[PDB]
Ligand binder design. Sequence first.
Ligand SMILES: [Zn+2]
Lengths: 119, 167, 92, 47, 154, 97
Amino acid sequence: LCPSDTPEGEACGLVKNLALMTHITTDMEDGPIVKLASNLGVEDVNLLCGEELSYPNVFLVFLNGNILGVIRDHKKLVNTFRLMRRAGYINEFVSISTNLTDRCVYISSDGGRLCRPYI
Amino acid sequence: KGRIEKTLLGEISEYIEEVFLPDDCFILVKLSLERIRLLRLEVNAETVRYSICTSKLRVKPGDVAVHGEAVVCVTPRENSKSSMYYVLQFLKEDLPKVVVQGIPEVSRAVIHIKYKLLVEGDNLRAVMATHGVKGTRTTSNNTYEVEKTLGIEAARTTIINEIQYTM
Amino acid sequence: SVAELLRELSLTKEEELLFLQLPDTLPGVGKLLIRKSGRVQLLLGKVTLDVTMGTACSFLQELVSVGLGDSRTGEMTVLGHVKHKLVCSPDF
Amino acid sequence: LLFCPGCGNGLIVEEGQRCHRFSCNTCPYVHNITRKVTNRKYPKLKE
Amino acid sequence: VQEIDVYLAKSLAEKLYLFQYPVRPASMTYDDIPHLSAKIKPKQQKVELEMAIDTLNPNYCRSKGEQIALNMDKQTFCSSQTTSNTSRYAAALYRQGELHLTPLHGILQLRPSFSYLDKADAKHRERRRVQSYEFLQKKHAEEPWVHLHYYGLR
Amino acid sequence: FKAMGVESDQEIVQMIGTEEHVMAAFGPSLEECQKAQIFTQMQALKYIGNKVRRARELLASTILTHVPVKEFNFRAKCIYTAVMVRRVILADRDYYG
Ligand SMILES: [Zn+2]
């Protein structure tokens, strides 16, 4: 968003303006996202309650807000999806992000996310 | 400062727990005594035992004891309201949050340098009356707690001051 | 601990039941290779190299392998307990 | 919190003869004088 | 470089059903061979057994008496299934010289069945939707003729 | 949690925290408060929901935490509630993710 383009008065920071090189995303199907998630390594509903806990190697994959299993190695998952997206097998817009404070990786195929390109 | 700012039983002690002896389960507090002399404040295991008593946790009898070398207090077990275990798992939470000593209302007191000390609290006349503070020279910034405690005319002078201070 | 199980399997000859999540590949003797540095790779059928390494914490419960023989006409018999799970992933 | 082998319903201590009879099917482990220890060391800020 | 080979062992794995226990991790508890009174279903196993309670713990006594039904005392189980797609997991028995793959059937978790408090409340009373499916099983729940026994088999 | 099918209390802590250090202070909070009234039963603990919801609540627990899907296999729903509790014991509204 533009930092300096805003009204003043009632809407001093409540009516923003999009910048130049942005792109709002549209929705898509979640088929190949799940299909690569379950190959790359995830498992849920068979794991003992204890697993998903303070143990470091339990990053739990979340897609669009629904848990899709847990991965022992977060890096392989974030890196492999990212190489796959760059290769073009997964839609360019989908984003894999990782929060290490709470071990949840976050595959978002939401549609409506503010996006932008980088080199 | 330690005389007027509150310090919970929790702040001054070592490894507390229940301990299981035949036919009972008594709690125990090890009560860090290096600290109590470090933080200038005057508690003792007798003073804790009076303060574990009259502290709304129903330990109002002499059930709480004083073991050791005035270094450890013990309270075993209550009388009713699921008294066998469920009050003891209740007791392990409320015991390190009883105020040992000081004004309970006062959050914390910070010294400032001649020396004075400012508190972030509200209980004025309990602060005004403690030993060491010349209560003739102590003000608030809460104009109601000067009105309840120091008359209306001091509550007039704070409304003059605390506006002319913030202006 | 990824290749440790194989070395521990090497340390005691006792047969160990293992749990394997293969990738979702339909059928279009397999070979397992342990690379130097512990990077176990299963060079499976079709000569594809699938990397399988580590898994969820296991043994934190009793997982038991049982062959149901339809005991009304057979027997349900526990054959083994469980060991660390193993997950197989395709590689790129 | 010590759990029950058999139902798993959490620790209850009956003060009769030192057992751990849970609200469900009795599995009272009458722990002898083994001394219970739970010292949850607290926090002690100073100065 | 252990190059151990994996046999795609065709030894019938249709019999193989993994059983899980999110109940017994405290002391490497093994379920123990002696207990019988075995009852098992093919779909939604609902393993019902003779997990008779010890008497080393001191009698338990009146509360067991207070239990109402205990039949020594069955500690049965109802199988929480997790069989959505069930071929993603198919490993078997592995030496350091040989490796035998076998593709299992649906894994089933086995938490403890109560039904003592369930039946207990009913007793006081005396004083969902298509829950069982269209065919009411009429069979899977009937199937428990069970024999857990010890045999070295592959 | 007992209404959701996981009836035992050992499972619930195993969900919330196996490493105990602060998730032990989940213990005397609620699973004791659950146990303080003799109410260990799955069907009976739908019943307390069956009163306040203004057997009939197997369905009306689908209008609670919706998008975690259930086919009357509530195991996926439990972890998502358990992770919601997991955050609190470990504890930005204006941030553009
Ligand atoms: Zn029990």
